[PDB]
Amino acid sequence: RVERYQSPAGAPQCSVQVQTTSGARALADTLCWQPELIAGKTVCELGAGAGLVSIVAFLAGADQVVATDYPDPEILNSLESNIREHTAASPKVVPYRWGDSPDSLQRCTGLQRFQVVLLADLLSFHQAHDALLRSVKMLLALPANDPTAVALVTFTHDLAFFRLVNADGALIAEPWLSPLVHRWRLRWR
């Protein structure tokens, strides 16, 4: 089942066709309107799924996109097949289980941490909220080096994930942009 995507009218502009096995569209939409969010930044996508946001991230001029999903051949292969089919410093596709030390991911890509971290539609399964939090804590660039470091979290209409973040006082979870599907933001401090 091929889902087709193209950016909205009046955006600083490409159509994407991907094999499949919502807030992804929303996070994408944002990236086209505000490419300067990720222009020249290092980007890591958690649960990249079909690969839409990572492809857009690339087309927006990130200096590295590391798209990740669960270590499953079926999903990774097509993730890569989709990402490659729209790439002519190519993005890397790396397996990563939420909560795992990122040593191997940092081995494969050369990056320790990331300036932008993208989380489209990962919020439905609650029992994973903790591992997601810890993942962001481990993957997001530390303020010492990058003060403008950010994790962009988008989801489709609970907010308990963000409750979980703030209770754990390391990161801080704030709303970020108006709803289309909601858009939030994680950050240090």
Side-chain angles (χ1 to χ4, degrees):
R1 278 283 199 88
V2 174
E3 292 280 312
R4 328 178 221 97
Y5 167 90
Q6 41 202 168
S7 33
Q13 278 310 128
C14 71
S15 49
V16 173
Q17 45 181 18
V18 285
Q19 293 266 58
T20 71
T21 312
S22 173
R25 267 179 148 260
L27 187 50
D29 279 355
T30 306
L31 292 206
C32 306
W33 271 80
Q34 306 178 48
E36 80 284 349
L37 282 167
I38 55 150
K41 300 252 177 192
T42 42
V43 167
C44 172
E45 218 213 314
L46 289 177
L52 188 62
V53 206
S54 295
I55 293 163
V56 173
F58 175 80
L59 296 151
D63 77 317
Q64 191 62 64
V65 180
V66 178
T68 73
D69 218 305
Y70 191 85
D72 176 304
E74 266 160 348
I75 75 169
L76 285 183
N77 282 334
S78 74
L79 182 49
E80 168 136 4
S81 174
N82 287 341
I83 281 175
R84 192 193 163 195
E85 261 201 318
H86 299 89
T87 303
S90 41
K92 296 211 197 323
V93 172
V94 146
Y96 175 69
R97 159 197 296 94
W98 310 343
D100 277 14
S101 95
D103 288 57
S104 73
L105 187 150
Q106 298 162 2
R107 197 221 294 111
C108 275
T109 56
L111 291 150
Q112 298 311 119
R113 290 182 126 96
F114 293 91
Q115 296 168 47
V116 187
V117 178
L118 297 171
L119 330 196
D121 273 305
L122 312 174
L123 297 194
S124 297
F125 208 71
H126 276 27
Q127 280 282 4
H129 284 171
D130 161 277
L132 238 173
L133 161 59
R134 283 188 288 98
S135 282
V136 178
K137 278 202 281 178
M138 293 174 109
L139 293 173
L140 191 60
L142 298 152
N145 305 308
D146 209 290
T148 178
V150 68
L152 305 176
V153 193
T154 202
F155 63 97
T156 173
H157 194 87
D158 209 306
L159 296 148
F161 170 66
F162 305 115
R163 299 189 182 106
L164 182 66
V165 177
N166 305 311
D168 176 289
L171 305 169
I172 183 139
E174 317 126 63
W176 166 47
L177 297 169
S178 65
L180 308 183
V181 44
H182 287 109
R183 302 180 285 182
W184 277 47
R185 181 219 288 194
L186 308 172
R187 236 172 79 255
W188 292 101
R189 284 158 189 242

